[PDB]
């Protein structure tokens, strides 16, 4: 009984979230990419192996593979944008 009464404000807050998802798609559509090491800034250079320094120490290097990977919550399409905006609206992990 209460669910059908609150169904008017559900149609509005879902329609309003979709427009913000589309705006986020327009703004950051494929801009959330990054390489494993913060020295290569495009997919071409982000290949092969690289030397990683643990916890900032220059005396403890380890060999790691650099991968050009996307973010977990991206704005590639209207669905990933809607899910990321839902996570933001839940106030969790939104500063990241």
């Amino acid at each position: 009984v209460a669910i059908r009464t609150i169904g008017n404000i559900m149609i509005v807050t879902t329609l309003l979230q979709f427009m913000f998802a589309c705006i986020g798609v327009q703004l950051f559509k494929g801009k959330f990419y990054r390489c494993t090491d913060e020295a290569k800034s495009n997919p071409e250079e982000c290949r092969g192996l690289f030397i990683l320094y643990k916890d900032g120490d220059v005396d403890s290097p380890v060999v790691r593979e650099r991968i050009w990977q996307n973010s977990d919550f991206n704005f590639d399409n209207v669905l990933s944008a809607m899910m990321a905006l839902f996570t933001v609206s839940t106030f969790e992990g939104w500063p990241a």
Binding site: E44, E45, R47, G48, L49, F50, I51, P61, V62, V63
Partner: protein, 93 residues
């Protein structure tokens, strides 16, 4: 071989590429052709003087090609552009 504390091969010349430099890139691969013509001269110099040690070309891209070929010696941090013999020849005091 004697007078060489490792195992070597005179058939060709080895190529060293540092860990942080990706082999197969456009710059490296282009560098990896025209250095292959150095193997003939590497052989020719050794024939005149059999008592000849490593002959190495340190490329400005990062790769070092040396003759005779021998496997490289923890992790590897060797870079040919930081070696003392490369630095003295790339500039003046």
């Amino acid at each position: 071989d004697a007078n060489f504390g490792r195992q070597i091969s005179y058939q060709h010349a080895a190529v060293h590429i540092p860990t942080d430099i990706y082999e197969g890139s456009t710059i490296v691969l282009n560098e990896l052709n025209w250095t292959s013509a150095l193997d003939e001269v590497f052989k020719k110099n050794r024939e005149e003087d059999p008592s000849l040690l490593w002959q190495v070309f340190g490329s400005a891209t990062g790769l070092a090609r040396y003759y005779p070929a021998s496997p490289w010696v923890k992790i590897d941090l060797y870079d040919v552009r930081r070696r003392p013999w490369y630095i003295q020849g790339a500039a003046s005091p």
